[PDB]
Amino acid sequence: SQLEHNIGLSIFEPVAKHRANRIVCTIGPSTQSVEALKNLMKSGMSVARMNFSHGSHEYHQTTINNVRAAAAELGLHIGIALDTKGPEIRTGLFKDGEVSFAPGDIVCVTTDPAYEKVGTKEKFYIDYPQLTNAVRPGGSIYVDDGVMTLRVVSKEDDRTLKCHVNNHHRLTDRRGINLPGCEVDLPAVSEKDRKDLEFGVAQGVDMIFASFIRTAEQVREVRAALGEKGKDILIISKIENHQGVQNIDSIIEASNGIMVARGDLGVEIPAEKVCVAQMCIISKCNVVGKPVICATQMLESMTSNPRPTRAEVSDVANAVLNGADCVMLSGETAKGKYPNEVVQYMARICVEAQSATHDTVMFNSIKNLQKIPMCPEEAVCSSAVASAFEVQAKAMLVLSNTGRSARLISKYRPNCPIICVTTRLQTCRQLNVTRSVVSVFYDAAKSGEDKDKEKRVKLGLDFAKKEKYASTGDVVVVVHADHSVKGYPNQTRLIYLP
Amino acid sequence: SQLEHNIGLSIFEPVAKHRANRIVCTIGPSTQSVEALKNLMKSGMSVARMNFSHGSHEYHQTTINNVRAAAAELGLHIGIALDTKGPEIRTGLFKDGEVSFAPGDIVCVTTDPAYEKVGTKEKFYIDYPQLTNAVRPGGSIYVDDGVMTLRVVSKEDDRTLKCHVNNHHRLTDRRGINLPGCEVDLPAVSEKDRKDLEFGVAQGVDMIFASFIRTAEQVREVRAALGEKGKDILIISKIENHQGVQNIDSIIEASNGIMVARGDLGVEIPAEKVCVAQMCIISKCNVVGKPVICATQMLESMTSNPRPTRAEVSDVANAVLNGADCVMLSGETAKGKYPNEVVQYMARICVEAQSATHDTVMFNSIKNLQKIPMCPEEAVCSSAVASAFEVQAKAMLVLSNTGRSARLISKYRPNCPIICVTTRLQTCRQLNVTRSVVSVFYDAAKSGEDKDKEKRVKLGLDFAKKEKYASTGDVVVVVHADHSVKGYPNQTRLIYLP
Amino acid sequence: SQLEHNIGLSIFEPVAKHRANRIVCTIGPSTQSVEALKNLMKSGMSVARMNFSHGSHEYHQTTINNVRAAAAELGLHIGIALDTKGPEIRTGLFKDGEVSFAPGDIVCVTTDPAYEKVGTKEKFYIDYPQLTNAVRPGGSIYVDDGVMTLRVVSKEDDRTLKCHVNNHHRLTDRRGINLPGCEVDLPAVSEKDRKDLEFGVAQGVDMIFASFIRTAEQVREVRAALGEKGKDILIISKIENHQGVQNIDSIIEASNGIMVARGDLGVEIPAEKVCVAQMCIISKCNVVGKPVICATQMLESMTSNPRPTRAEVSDVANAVLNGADCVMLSGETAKGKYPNEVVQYMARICVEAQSATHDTVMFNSIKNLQKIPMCPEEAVCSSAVASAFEVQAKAMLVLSNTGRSARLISKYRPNCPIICVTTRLQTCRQLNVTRSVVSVFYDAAKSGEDKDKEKRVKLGLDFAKKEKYASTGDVVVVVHADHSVKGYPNQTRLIYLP
Amino acid sequence: SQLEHNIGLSIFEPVAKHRANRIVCTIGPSTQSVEALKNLMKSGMSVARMNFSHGSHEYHQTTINNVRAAAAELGLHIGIALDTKGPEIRTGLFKDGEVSFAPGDIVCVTTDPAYEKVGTKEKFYIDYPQLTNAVRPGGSIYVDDGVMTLRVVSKEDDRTLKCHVNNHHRLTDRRGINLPGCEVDLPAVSEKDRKDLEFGVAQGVDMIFASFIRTAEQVREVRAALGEKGKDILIISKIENHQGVQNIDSIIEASNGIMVARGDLGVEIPAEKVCVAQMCIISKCNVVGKPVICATQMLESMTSNPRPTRAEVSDVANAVLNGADCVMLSGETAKGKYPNEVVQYMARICVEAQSATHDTVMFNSIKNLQKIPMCPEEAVCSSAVASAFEVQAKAMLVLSNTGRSARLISKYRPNCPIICVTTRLQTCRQLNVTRSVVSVFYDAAKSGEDKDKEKRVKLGLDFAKKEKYASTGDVVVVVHADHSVKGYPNQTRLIYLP
Ligand SMILES: O=P(O)(O)OC[C@H]1O[C@@](CO)(OP(=O)(O)O)[C@@H](O)[C@@H]1O
Ligand SMILES: O=P(O)(O)OC[C@H]1O[C@@](CO)(OP(=O)(O)O)[C@@H](O)[C@@H]1O
Ligand SMILES: [K+]
Ligand SMILES: [K+]
Ligand SMILES: [K+]
Ligand SMILES: [K+]
Ligand SMILES: [Mg+2]
Ligand SMILES: [Mg+2]
Ligand SMILES: [Mg+2]
Ligand SMILES: [Mg+2]
C-alpha cells in the first residue's frame, strides 16, 4: 500500500545517483547567451523551450544557434522545442487606452467589429464572432487572464450581450478573453503560427509545443501544417481548457505527447480542478506510453528568490510522483535572477521524488491495463523491464532508430537508466522528453551498417561503463532484434559487463 | 490501483457537499477583530492559532476574547491553539531597521547584549549566548527563514564570531536564525514558554502547538509545565528539525498529534527532503489515528495576491491526498490582504482533493496495519466505517465525551461526515483538528444523564437533518455503548432517519 | 496467496475444536433403528435424508418417528429431509425379460407405446414422447445409468431412431435412460411425487431435496405443490443435468438451497466436467448466501471397508475447501457396514479442511462481489463477521426467527461458531444445513415475549458457556435489533461473557 | 479471487488441446507385454514405474526391454522409474494362504524365521527382527495397508509379542506392516536396495523413487549407492511417514523431486491429515521448481470397474489444481482389468482441471516468493513465461541439455506447451515428470555442434508445426543463450512461425 510504503520512507538514506525525470527550460534574456546555456545544461536542462508568444524570428534564431553551440561544446544532445503563440480571443481597444470597472457595472460586449477601436465603460468589442452562441445568460466571460469576471445577464441582439461586472479592474487595449466551459471554434493554426512552424521546420526543431489544442482534428491540422519536411517532428499538445480535458483520449492518440499547461488551464477551469485534470492526464499518458510534461509556476518564487517556497517543492515532487516524464520552467529561467539555482533545485527535488517512488508499483499498474494480446515488441519491452527488476539490473540498453523502442521501455518505468543507442541525432534530441532515457549516437556513415548489432551494443556498454551507470560484472538488460527480424526488437538478453 | 483510479477522474462531476478536512488560521493584525474572525469562521476556519513568538499576553487575550465572542455570535465551536515560541534564535535590532549585505561582506556576530539595539553591516547581535560553542569555524549560520547564509571564519572570542556573508540580503528587525547540524542546547520549555503555557491553562486554550519538539522527553516536559489543571489540553508536537524527524515514532507516541512544521524544517534539513518527511510523518500519524497538520507557505503568494499559484493549489491538494487532517495558514491570514479569500480557496481545494480520493483505499491500508486482536471499541469503530461504505451512509453518528471514539472512527477515514455528540464543550473544540468530525454539544447537567442514549442520538439525528447531511429515510450509522457498558462504545446500529 | 498459505500449513498443530461443516445422512436398513440413529447423531449427523426413490410411506414413517425419538433422547434438533424420486425416463420391457447387446449392433428405439412390453435386440421402447426431437443423428442416448451407450444414426419416422450400440451390455426390463445435453420436457413433479410431498407436509418435514430440477419454473411448481401448509419448508434443488447447470443462476434465485447431485450429474455430463460444475455451483451459492450440499460417493468404499480410500479423503476435504456447507452420505449410511465410522471420518476430515482454510479469504472474496449499497441487515451481518475477526471472537450470537439472519451471518464465513437463538423449533432443524450455526430454542409461550432481547441473549450466552464455545471474559459478537426496529437486525454489539 | 474465478467457470467451453500434466503408470501382469505398453503409451503414460517391492531382476529386465521396444515403435521418449522396496516390513506366509481373524482374537507375532512359511490364526511371522524393541505393550501394529489393528498385550520374549486383534480381516500372503509412532531403525539402503540400485544404474533407469525417505541424509545415502556412473539419475523422494513430512524442507533441498506417497503416509499419520500434507508438500515443491508426483488410490475402484467414482475424479482434478506435475497409478495399471481406460480417464480429468485453472495465479504466486536478485537464467525464464501470457503464445521453445532450463520455465507454470530441444536422450526421458514439457532430441554428434542454435530452433519450430501446437504466423517464445554465453540461457526471443 502507498501508506505502508510511506511509513518506511527514510530522509537519511542516500538518494538515487541517476536522475530519471527531465527538465524543460524556457530561454529568455536571463539565459540566451552561449555561456548561460552551458550552465543551464550543466545544471540539468534537457530541452530548451522557445516561447513564440514573444520575440521575433531573429530572436529565436539566436536561441537556436546558441543552444547548438553550447551543446556542441559539452557534447550533449539537447532538444529544441517551439512553443506556438496559438489562436486567441481579445477585446478591442478602448478610448484613451483604458477604462476602469467596478462591481455592479453593466457593460455591453459586442461582436460588431465597428466597435473594435472605441471601447468604453458602456460597450466594448470582443473579436470572437460566435460569442453570443457560445456563452448563455448566467455564463461567465473572463477578461485579462481571469482577473476580471463578467456574468452574462442577457442577449440584446445576435451580436451583443449585456453583462454584469463582478470585480474591480482596469482594462487596457486588447486584453485576453477566456470563455470558461464553452466550445471555441478557432482554427488549430493561426496565420502567425504557420510562419512560426515553417520557421521551425526550416531550422530543424525537434518538437512543437502546440497551444490550445481542443480536438484530435486540430492535432492533425498541426501535423498537416508541418508538411512532408516536418513529418518527424514531435507534436506535444498543450491541454489548456475544458475541451482539451474532455477530448484527452483522442488528443493523446493523435499527439506524440502532452503538456498539462496549468497556467491557461487554471484560467479556463476552476483553479482547484487543475489538480484533478493533472492527475488524470498524466496517468492517461502513462497508460499509453506517451511523454507528458507538467508546466507552469512550479518554482515561481525562484524568479526572485534564491530558495523555493515549501508549496513549490511539493509541487515538483508531486508531479514526479503523479508520473510526469518532464517538469518545466518558464519565467524562472526565461527572466528570473537565479536560472541556474532553480534548475538545480528542480533536479534535486526530482531525484528525491524518484527515490521515494515505490519501484514496481507503476510497472505493475501500467502493465495491468494493457490490452492482451500485446504486440510482440511491447511484450519484449515490458518483460525486459520485469527482468531488470528481477536481477536488480543497473542499466538497460536498447537499440532504437526512431525512438519508439526506447519510449516503449520507458513506458514501463524501470528504476534504472535506459541507454538508447540510436542512428539519428534527432532521436537523441527527442528522447530528452522521455523518463530515464540516456542517448548515445552511433554513426553508421562512419562505422558501417551493423546488421548484427554488435557495434551498437559495444558502444552502449562502453557508454554504460564510462558514465558510471554500471561496472564490470554487473548485469545489463539488452533489447534489440535478432539477426533476421526487421523494424522492431523481438529479443531481450541479460549480459554481464565484461 | 492509483493509476486506474486516476484515469477515471473527471473535472465535470459535482464535488462533495461536506468538507472533511479542517483549516487552522493564524491570527494577527489582518484578522484579530471580532468582525474579521467572524468572516474567517464563515470562510472556513476551524482553529485559531495564537503565535506566541510575538505579542504580549494582553495581545493574545484580545485574540482569545474576540474568538469566543465571534464563535458565540455564530453558534460555532472554534478551537484555540497556543503555539509556543520555544527554543527560537533571533537577531537583535539594527540602526534604521535594515542593514544590507553584499557577498564576501565580512561581519562580526556577537552574543553580547550591549549590541542588541544597535546592529550594523559590521557587527550585530544574536540572542543565543552559547553561539560560539554551537558553531565552529567552517560551520554555517542561516538567517531569516534560510534566505541568507554566513560561513564562520573564526571565533574572535567567547562572545564574537567573524563571519563571511555568502549572498545578497536586506535584513529587517529580529529575524530568525537556524543552526542546522549544530548541538544547540536550549530547553523545550524556557522560562518564557512556562509563563505562556500557564497563561494558556488559565485562559482555557484547547491545544498547544509545541515548537521544535526533539524527543518524547520534551513532549513530557510540555505536559508537566501544563500541570494538573492542564492535563486535558492536546499537545500537538511540531516537527521542525532533523532530530524531530529521527525520533518521530516515540514523539508520536507521546503526543496527541503532530504538525509538519515545514517552515523551520525546510531550513533545518535540505528543502527537497521535506516532501519525503511530510509523506512519512502524515502516514505514521494516520496509522495510529492521531491528528496531523500540514503547515506553512501553502498559499503563500496569496499573502499579497487575490489568486494562488498553480504550485500552491497542488500543495494543498496533495497534503489532503497524503492523509493530513488539517491544513494551516500563517502569514496568509495573520498579515495578508486577502485573509477571507485565502481561506475560501483552501476550503475549495480541500473539497476537490477529498472528492478525488478513492473511497476505501485509506480504510483498508489503515486496517491492514493494525495489530490483531484489536480492542473491542476499535473493532466496533472500524466495522462501523465499513458498514457505512456498504450502505452508502450519508452520515455517521457517534457519542463521545473525551473525543476518543470520534478520533477512532475518523482514523478509518469514512467518506461521509462523522457527527459527534459530546458532553464537553472542550471536546467540541478539540475535535476541530480531526478529519470529518462535526460536533454537537449535549449539556448533561441541563438535560439529564441520558443513560439509554436516546436524547443524544435524537440531538444528532436532528442535526443531521438540519445541516442537510441526510434526510428522512436515509441510513445513518450510529455508534455508542449499549445499556450497560461504560467507558467506550461496544455497539453499532444502522438507523433510518425518521 | 493460496500457495503461500499452503507452504505454511502444519499437520502437527491442534485442529479446530468446533466443527463448522454439516453432515447429511441417508437412512436405511443399516441406520433406521432408534439405537442406530442415536449413534449416527453422536457421530455427527445433522440432517437425516429419506430417499423416496425406495420404500413405502410406512417405511419412511418409521424413519420420521425414530429420528424424532432419537433426537428427543439426546436433546438435539435434527433436520428431516425428503428426497423425491423425481420424474424419469425408462425403456420398455423386453421379451424373456432381458436382451444382450454387442458393439456394432443396430437397434431401433421407438416412442410408439405399442412396443412397450415387446422389446427385442432389434427394437425397443423408450417412454419419452419427444425423443426424436430431443436427440439428433450423432447424438447419444445413455441406457442404465450410462453403462450402455447408443449413437443415433438416423431418424426413421417421427417416433423411431436407428441407433448404433457402443459397448457390451445386458438390458433387463425398464432401465433408466439419460439424454446427455438434451432439454427434457418432463414435469417438475410426477404423480408419485405429489403424494410424496403431501406426505412430507403432513409429517412436518423440514426440507425437500427436489430431484432433476432444470428450471426456476420447476422450483416454483415444487413450491406450489407444497401449497399453503408447506410454505415454510426449504426447497433444496438437486442439480442433475446440463440444463440444471446452465440455469443455475435462476434456479439458485428460486430455491432455498442447492445439491450438487454428482451421481446423476456424472451420468448426464462427462464425469470429468463434474468438478468444474461443482466448483462453479458451490461458489455461486456462497456468493448469494444459500446453503449448498455436495453429494454422492464421497466415502463410497466405506460402504464395505472400515477406512476410506485416499481419493475419498481428499474428495471430502476439497468439497469443504470449495466452500460447501454440507457433505452427504448415501449408501455409506443407508446400507453400509460401518455407518458410524463413516460419519466419524467425515466429521474428522471436515475439521481438518476447516483448520487448513485461510480465515478471512472467503470473507473478503464474498464481500467483494456484493452489490453496493447493501440492505442494512446485510451490512450489519458482514460487519459483525468482520468485527469477529478483528477481536478474535470465539463465538457470535444472533437472534433469528425465520433463520434469515443466521444464514446471512454464515454467508460471510466466520471462523467461529454462530449461536442462533430462535423462537421456532423448525428453524433449529433447518439451520442444520448452514455452516457454523448452532441453534438454541427460546420458548416464548413459556418465558414470555422478550421485546428487549435480554432473555434470548442471556440464553445464548449461557449456551455459549455450557457448550464450551467461550468462557468468562471472552468477547462474543451479538447481532439482533435495537429496541424499536422490527423484522431484521440493525444492531451489532461486542460483549464480554460475564 | 478464487471465488470470482469459480463463478465464471463453464462446462460448455472447449477444453485445452494439449495436456500439461503427466501420468506415471506402474507396470505389472496387466501391462508388461510390448503390446500392453504400447497401448498405455498411446493412452497417455509418460513414465513407467517398476515396483521393486516384488519381482526379480529378471522380471524387471523384461519390463525395461519391453518399455524400450514399445517406445521405439512409437517414436516416444518414455521415462523409466525404479521404485525401491526400502525399509519395508511384511508378514510371512500362512498355511493355505489366508487365515481369518475375529475381534478379541489373541495372537502371537514372532520375528523367528522358523515360522515364516507356516503362519496360523495363533502365531505368524513378521520380517522385522527388532520388532519387540520397536513396539512395547499398549503400542499398535497395523497390518495390510492399515486395514487391521493389533494392540500389544505383552512381550513374551525377545522374539515374540502377544497381541489382541482389534477387528475383522481376512489375511493374504506377505502383507504390509506399519508401526506408526515407533522407533523403527532400518536402513534407507538395505543390502537388497543396494543391488536394485546398481541394477538400475547398469540398466540405465532414468529416476529412482526412493521409498520411506526420512532425512536429507537418507537422500544422500541413495545418491552414494548410485555411485559415479549413476550421478545424473533423478532421485524422487517418497514422503511416506511422519518424519518425512517433518523434514520436508531439507528433503526437498537434497532431492530432484518428491512423491506424496499417500498409501503408506495415510497409515503412518491419521488419514484425514494426508490432505493437509499433500497441499503443503506440493506447494513447497512448486515454490523451488521441483517436480512433485501425487500418488496412490487416485482411480482405485477402476482396478475392477470400467468407471471411476465421483470421489476419484475429484481427487485427480484436485491434485492438478493443487499444483502437482504428475499423477500416478499403481494397482490400477499393474493389475487392473481396465489399464487403458483408467489412463484415459486420468488424462481427460487432467485436461479438465488444467482448463479450469486460472491462467496467471500460479505464475504470480510463485514469482512473488522468489528471493531477489534472481540469477540471470531465472529472470530470463520467468520473464519469458510472462511474455508468453502477454502475446497469448501457443508454445514456448527452450534449448536444454541437462533439463534445468526446461524445469525452470515449467516452474512458472505457463498455459501452453514448453517444447524442449535437448541433446540428451536421458533428458527427454527425465523431463516426463515436468508439467507442460514436450521433448525433441537433437543428436549433436550426428548433426553438428549448432553453436548459433539455428539447427535446434528449426527442429523445435517444425515440431511445433507438425504436432499442431502452432501454425504459420503464430508467435512462439524461444529461450536459449546468445552467441557467446555458455552454461545457461541469457536470451528470450519472440518469433513468428515461418
Ligand atoms: O527505431 P525503433 O522503431 O525503435 O526500432 C529499433 C529496433 O529495430 C531493429 C531491427 O530492425 O533495428 P536495427 O535494424 O537498426 O538493428 C532492432 O535492432 C531495434 O531494436
Ligand atoms: O427471523 P429473522 O428474519 O432472522 O429476523 C430476526 C431479527 O428481527 C428481530 C427484530 O424484529 O427479531 P425480534 O423481533 O424477535 O427481536 C431482531 O431482534 C432479530 O435479530
Ligand atoms: K506560447
Ligand atoms: K511559534
Ligand atoms: K431420490
Ligand atoms: K516400492
Ligand atoms: Mg493560451
Ligand atoms: Mg517553526
Ligand atoms: Mg435422477
Ligand atoms: Mg509406499
3-state secondary structure labels for all residues of chain A? CHHHHHHCCCCCCCCCCCCCCEEEEECCCCCCCHHHHHHHHHHCEEEEEEECCCCCHHHHHHHHHHHHHHHHHHCCCCEEEEECCCCCCEECCEHHHEEEECCCCEEEEECCHHHCCCECCCEEEECCCCHHHHCCCCCEEEECCCCEEEEEEEEEECCEEEEEECCCEEEECCCEEECCCCCCCCCCCCHHHHHHHHHHHHHCCCEEEECCCCCHHHHHHHHHHHCCCCCCCEEEEEECCHHHHHCHHHHHHHCCEEEEEHHHHHHHCCHHHHHHHHHHHHHHHHHHCCCEEEECCCCHHHHCCCCCCHHHHHHHHHHHHHCCCEEEECHHHHCCCCHHHHHHHHHHHHHHHHHHCCCCHHHHHHHHCCCCCCCHHHHHHHHHHHHHHHCCCCEEEEECCCCHHHHHHHHCCCCCCEEEEECCHHHHHHHHHCCCEEEEECCHHHHCCCCCCHHHHHHHHHHHHHCCCCCCCCEEEEEECCCCCCCCCCEEEEEECC
Three cell numbers, residue D3 = 471465488
Find cell 455570535 and name the residue: B73
Residues A232, B363: Cα–Cα separation, whole Å:
48
DSSP element (H, E) containing D67: helix D57-74
Of C272, C301, C308, the CB nearest to D349: C272
Extract the C-alpha cell encoding B188: 523545550
Which ranges constitute the DSSP H helices of B75-190? 131-134
Distance in Å, CA C174 to ligand 9 centroid: 15
- At B17, phi and psi to the nearest 5? -85, -15
**Run of H or E residues at C456:** helix C454-466
Q: Which long-range contacts link A236-239 to residues 24+ away (Cβ below 8 Å)?
A: A236/A81, A236/A207, A236/A208, A236/A209, A236/A210, A236/A291, A236/A293, A236/A433, A237/A210, A237/A213, A238/A83, A238/A86, A238/A209, A238/A210, A238/A211, A238/A212, A238/A213, A238/A264, A238/A295, A239/A213, A239/A265, A239/A277, A239/A281
CA distance B66 to B76: 13
* D301 interface with C at CB cutoff 8 Å: yes
Residues 357-386 of D with CB under 8 A from A: 372-376, 378-380, 382-384, 386
Are C270 and D351 in contact by the 8 Å Cβ rule? The answer is: no
User: B327 to chain A: which residues are within 8 Å by CB?
Assistant: none
Question: Measured between alpha carbons, how far is B261 from B241 in angstroms, rounded to an integer?
Answer: 9
The CA distance from C264 to D76, in Å, is 39
**Residues with C-beta less than 6 Å from any ligand 1 atom:** A 399-402, 404-405, 453, 480-481, 486-489
- Check C19, C38, C223, C238 and give the catalytic one: C238
- Whether D373 and A387 lie within 8 Å, measured CB to CB: no
Solved using: X-ray
CATH 3.40.50.720 fits A1-18+354-497, yes or no: no
DSSP-assigned states of every residue in D191-235 = HHHHHHHHHHHHHT-SEEEETT--SHHHHHHHHHHH-GGGTTSEE
> Alpha-carbon distance C380 to C327, whole Å?
29
Q: Tell me the torsion sign for CA atoms B409, B413, B419, B424.
A: positive
- Give the separation between CA D349 and CA C273, rounded to whole angstroms: 8
d(CA A247, CA A266): 17
Helix B191-203 vs helix B216-226: crossing angle, to nearest 10:
50
Residues A58 and A64: their CA atoms lie apart, in Å, by: 10
The C-alpha angle C321, C327, C332, rounded to 5 degrees, equals 130
Q: Which helix (H) or strand (E) holds B265?
A: helix B262-268
Residues B395 and B416 sit within 8 Å (Cβ to Cβ):
yes
Catalytic: which of A238, A290, A367, A435? A238
CA distance D311 to C295: 10
Angle, helices D216-226/D191-203, rounded to nearest 10 degrees: 50
Known binder of ligand: residue B49?
yes
Question: Which set of grid coordinates corresponds to residue C100?
Answer: 444382450
Of B382, D318, B311, C63, give the one whose Cα is nearest residue A274: B311
Q: How far apart are CA B155 and CA B109, in angstroms?
A: 10
Q: Percent helix, strand, coil in chain B (nearest 5)?
A: 40, 20, 40
In chain C, what residues touch D3 (CB-CB under 8 Å)?
283, 286-287, 323, 362, 365-366, 369
Chain B positions in Cβ-Cβ contact with residue A282 (cut-off 8 Å): 6
Residues D351 and D17: beta-carbon distance below 8 Å: no
Return the C-alpha cell found at C493: 454489539
In the reported structure, the alpha carbon of residue A60 is separated from the centroid of ligand 3 by a whole-number distance in angstroms of: 13
d(CA D269, CA D247): 15
Q: Give the position of cell 476410506.
A: C308
**Which runs of consecutive H residues, i.e. helices, occur in C107-260?**
131-134, 191-203, 216-226, 242-246, 248-254
Architecture, CATH, for domain A19-86+188-353: Alpha-Beta Barrel (3.20)
User: What contacts D411, CB < 8 A, 6 or more positions away?
Assistant: D286, D289, D366, D381
**In this structure, are residues D137 and D153 in contact, taking their beta carbons and an 8 Å threshold?**
yes
Q: Among C65, C151, C53, C322, which residue's Cα sits nearest to residue D353?
A: C322
Strand ranges (DSSP E) for C342-453? 395-399, 418-422, 437-441
Say if residues B492 and B478 touch (Cβ distance below 8 Å): yes
Residue A97 CB coordination number (10 Å)? 10
Please name which of C32, C38, C36 lies closest in space to residue C55, comparing C-alpha atoms. Answer: C32
Site to substitute for ligand 2 among C375, C480, C484, most atoms within 8 A of C-beta: C480
* C-alpha cell read off for C380: 450489519
Q: Which chain C residue lies closest to D350 (C-alpha atoms)? A: C272
Grid coordinates representing C297?
Answer: 460417493
The answer to whether C264 is a known ligand-binding residue is yes
What single-letter amino acid sits at A366?
I
Q: Which residues contact C64 (CB under 8 A, 6 or more apart)?
A: C50, C80, C203, C205
List the catalytic residue out of B19, B38, B49, B262. Answer: B49
Residue D239 · residue D265 · CB < 8 Å: yes
Q: Are D406 and D432 in contact (CB under 8 A)?
A: no
CB contacts, 8 Å: B416 with chain C: none
Kindly tell me the burial class for residue B359, based on how many C-beta atoms sit within 10 Å of its own C-beta (0-12, 13-18, 19 or more): middle
What's the one-letter identity of residue B491?
Answer: Q
Ligand in nearest proximity to the CA of D265: 10
Give the integer Cα–Cα distance in Å for A369 and B2.
Answer: 12
B130-145 burial, b for 16+ CB within 10 Å, e for fewer?
ebbebbeeebbbbbbb
- A312/B314 CB distance under 8 A: no
Q: Domains of chain D: which residue ranges?
A: 1-18+354-497, 19-86+188-353, 87-187
**Of D1, D78, D65, nearest to D33 (Cα)?**
D65
Q: What spacing in Å lies between the alpha carbon of B123 and ligand 4's midpoint?
A: 27
Which among C375, C397, C408, C488 is the best mutation to test ligand 2's pocket, defined by most ligand atoms within 8 Å of the CB?
Answer: C488
Q: Report whether A307 belongs to an annotated binding site.
A: no
Classify strands A437-441 and A418-422 as parallel, antiparallel or unpaired: parallel
Order of strands, edge to edge, in the sheet holding C148-157?
Answer: C123-125, C106-110, C160-165, C148-157, C140-143, C177-178
Residues in contact with C29: Cβ distance below 8 Å, sequence separation at least 6, in sequence order: C334, C335
Phi, psi of C156, rounded to the nearest 5 degrees = -90, -50
- Count of residues in chain C: 498
Distance separating alpha carbons of residues B178 and B142, to the nearest angstrom: 5
B residues 254..273 contacting A (CB < 8 A): 262-263, 266, 269-273
Number of C–D residue contacts, CB under 8 Å? 208
Check if the beta carbon of residue A461 is closer than 8 Å to that of residue A453.
no
Instruction: List the alpha helices (DSSP H) in B431-491.
Output: 444-447, 454-466
Q: Is A283 on the interface with B (CB under 8 A)?
A: yes
Q: What separation, in Å, do the N-terminal and C-terminal C-alpha atoms of chain B show? A: 39
What strands, in cross-sheet order, belong to the sheet with A177-178? A123-125, A106-110, A160-165, A148-157, A140-143, A177-178
Q: Strand D326-329 relative to strand D292-295: parallel, antiparallel, unpaired?
A: parallel
- Say if CB B386 and CB C390 are below 8 A apart: no
Nearest in space to D359 (alpha carbons), one of D335, D393, D313? D393
Peptide bond just before B373 cis, omega within 30 deg: yes
> In terms of residues, how long is chain B?
498
Phi, psi of B37 (to 5 degrees): -65, -40
- Residues contacting ligand 2 via CB (< 6 Å): C 399-402, 404-405, 453, 480-481, 486-489
Helical spans, DSSP H, in B297-403 = 310-322, 331-334, 339-356, 361-368, 376-391
Q: What is the DSSP letter of D15?
A: P
Grid-cell match 546398481, residue found: D198
Q: How many CA atoms lie within 13 A of D215 on its CB side?
A: 9
Q: From start to end of D200-348, where are the E strands? A: 207-210, 234-239, 257-261, 292-295, 326-329
D34-43 and D57-74 helices cross at what angle (nearest 10)? 60
Put simply, the answer to whether A376 touches D490 (Cβ < 8 Å) is: no
| Ramachandran assignment for C8, one of left (phi > 0), alpha (psi -120 to 50 degrees), beta (any other) | alpha
Strands of B111-230, DSSP E: 123-125, 140-143, 148-157, 160-165, 169-171, 177-178, 207-210
In sequence order, the 6+-apart residues with CB closer than 8 A to the CB of A286 are A292, A323, A362, A366, A411, A413, B3
Question: What is the C-alpha radius of gyration for chain A, rounded to an integer number of angstroms?
Answer: 24
Instruction: Report whether B37 contacts B67 (CB < 8 A).
Output: yes
Resolution value (Å, 1 decimal):
2.3
Other CB atoms within 10 Å distance of the CB of residue A471: 10
- Whether residue C373 is preceded by a cis peptide bond, meaning omega within 30 degrees of 0, is yes
| Cis, bond preceding A270 (omega within 30 deg of 0) | no
B491 contacts: CB under 8 Å, gap ≥ 6:
B380, B479, B480, B481, B482, B485, C491, C492, C493, C494
Tell me how far the alpha carbon of residue B385 is from its chain's centroid: 25
Q: Which of left, alpha, beta for A79 (phi over 0: left; psi -120 to 50: alpha)?
A: beta
Cβ within 8 Å of residue B297, ≥6 positions away: A309, A310, A311, B262, B263, B312, B315, B330
**Contacts of residue D301 in chain C, CB cutoff 8 Å?**
300-301, 309
- Cβ–Cβ < 8 Å for D400, D406: yes
Contact D122, D108 (CB under 8 A): yes
- Taking the C-alpha atoms of residue A443 and residue C376, their distance in angstroms, rounded to an integer, is 71
Contact status of C297 with chain D (Cβ, < 8 Å): yes
* Touching subunits for chain A (3+ Cβ pairs under 8 A): B, D
| Residues in chain C closer than 8 A to B389 (CB atoms) | 372
Whose atoms come closest to the Cα of D176: which ligand?
A: 10
Please indicate whether residue A90 is annotated as part of the active site: yes
Q: What share of chain C is helix, strand, coil (3-state, %, to 5)?
A: 40, 20, 35
Domains D1-18+354-497 and D19-86+188-353 share a fold: no
Residues around the ion ligand 9 (C-beta < 5 A): C 264
| Rounded Cα–Cα distance for residues C158 and C54 (Å) | 35
Burial of B255 (0-12, 13-18, 19+ CB in 10 A): buried
Whether residue C49 lies in the annotated active site:
yes
CA distance C317 to C337: 23
As a whole number of angstroms, the distance between CA A134 and CA C76 comes to 79
Please give the radius of gyration of chain C, using alpha carbons only, rounded to the nearest integer.
24
| Most A CBs within 10 Å, among B4, B11, B19, to test the A interface | B11
Atom of ligand 2 nearest to the CA of C406: 4
